[PDB]
Amino acid sequence: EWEALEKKLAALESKXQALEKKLEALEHG
C-alpha cells in the first residue's frame, strides 16, 4: 500500500513539472 502511493505520487510530481513547462510554452508562443 505505502509503496504503491509513493510511486504514484512521484509520477504525478514529474507530470506536474512537465505541465508547468507546457503551459508556459503555450502562453509564450
Residue 12 interacts with, from a copy of itself, Zn ion, none (CB under 5-8 Å by kind): a copy of itself
Residue ranges binding a copy of itself (CB under 8 A): 1-2, 5-6, 8-9, 12-13, 15-16, 19-20, 22-23, 25-27
> What DSSP line would sit under 5-29, residue for residue?
HHHHHHHHHHHHHHHHHHHHHHHH-
Residue 28 interacts with, from Zn ion, a copy of itself, none (CB under 5-8 Å by kind): Zn ion
Cα dihedral sign, 18-24-25-26: positive
- What is the largest distance, in Å, between two alpha-carbon atoms of the chain? 42
Applying CB under 5 A, among 5, 12, 27, 29 the residue interacting with Zn ion is: 27
